[PDB]
Design a protein around this ligand. Sequence first.
Ligand SMILES: O=C(O)c1ccccc1O
Ligand SMILES: O=C(O)c1ccccc1O
Ligand SMILES: O=C(O)c1ccccc1O
Ligand SMILES: O=C(O)c1ccccc1O
Lengths: 215, 215
Amino acid sequence: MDPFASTRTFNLAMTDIGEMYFMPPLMEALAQRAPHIQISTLRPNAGNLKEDMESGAVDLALGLLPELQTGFFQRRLFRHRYVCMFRKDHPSAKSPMSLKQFTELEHVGVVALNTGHGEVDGLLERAGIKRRMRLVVPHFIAIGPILHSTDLIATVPQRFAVRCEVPFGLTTSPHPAKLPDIAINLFWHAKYNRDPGNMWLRQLFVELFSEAHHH
Amino acid sequence: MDPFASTRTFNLAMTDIGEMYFMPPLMEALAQRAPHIQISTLRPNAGNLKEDMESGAVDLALGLLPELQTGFFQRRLFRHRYVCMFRKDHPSAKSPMSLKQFTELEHVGVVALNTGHGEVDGLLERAGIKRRMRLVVPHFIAIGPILHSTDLIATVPQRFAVRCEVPFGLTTSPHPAKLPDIAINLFWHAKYNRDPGNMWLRQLFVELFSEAHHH
Ligand SMILES: O=C(O)c1ccccc1O
Ligand SMILES: O=C(O)c1ccccc1O
Ligand SMILES: O=C(O)c1ccccc1O
Ligand SMILES: O=C(O)c1ccccc1O
């Protein structure tokens, strides 16, 4: 069936950041290419996501999702690093920040339970980096106005940080801790590898967001 | 014990919008008034929130939470209405929008499962207002960039809409449907009505956010 004929609803898993990044250009393109398709999103749910992708309840997932392993396929959209972010007139924070100073200032922690970002707190702690967690929030999206009004600092994905800098008057430093890359991928389950609708929507994601040729 | 002595961690339930609104001024004030208190937040969870407030696992909840009834107390911070929001150069949407036009244009739906905002879809539908839901997302925070890049419209809390207008080039119309007020309240469970730490943090919320005298 041609894309214009499709009235299928595709269910897509992604974080708050992912929704702000992926949804505006996707829906813009869908209105031109397949205007009767419906999209619904949901936040990643580590308890349910694999099962939901196996059963076909969730069609695609986008983000840092290291648990989607055997039985899944992935295509790389881009990769980026964690950075330290803080307000631009912070009284003492500097770029490049020292590990000592990272460890002295107070933090907004981000739990990010159902994604690879949930690994950060344990990676720091096992390296023996103790942080004074003044505030802990579950997700990244509200970090910006919090850092603006305080002397707190945060460990944040670089592409999201860059989007926060001007609107909230923040700046960033390369991260002094050794943290892994953030690989942002498009995921699907092997059972839907040759489903024509899933294939078509995957190719659209690649066309709109893949930096394999770009960069 | 004096507030400077307190090292207590208070756990606070609020939406993404609530976190962006309440957390920056709260943490700013805490750094001046009670600098050793820790705060952690979480999103409202209708299955668990009442039980969690009864047991003392969640100290306070902020937002539109009509299920917190017998056994709870509430203080009004402010109230506001739903509005229609869309991009400022939308090719046909106008303010004041007609019910007919609301019903003709396509929508980004917001599920808002664990809050009173989860009532909107059913309230419209029972009034016989059928909407073409092109995109459905679980929460409000990412609505802004989506509306910017599309001809979609959305039913949104007015104070959040106003914050979106300039950064995302959107505008609003009074809502043509009959929808209830959005009462934004501070909630606590009766078991903690006279806990001195809970009382102190409630009074801070009232001082920072209550519009009872203001307005
Ligand atoms: O972490 C994500 O889920 C993400 C999604 C889109 C763009 C950048 C990101 O870090
Ligand atoms: O099966 C679908 O709904 C579909 C959607 C878009 C493109 C090709 C397709 O087969
Ligand atoms: O809906 C909310 O939870 C809310 C919170 C803060 C300010 C405005 C709001 O609508
Ligand atoms: O019990 C507390 O931790 C507390 C915190 C702030 C103010 C008064 C208090 O008793």
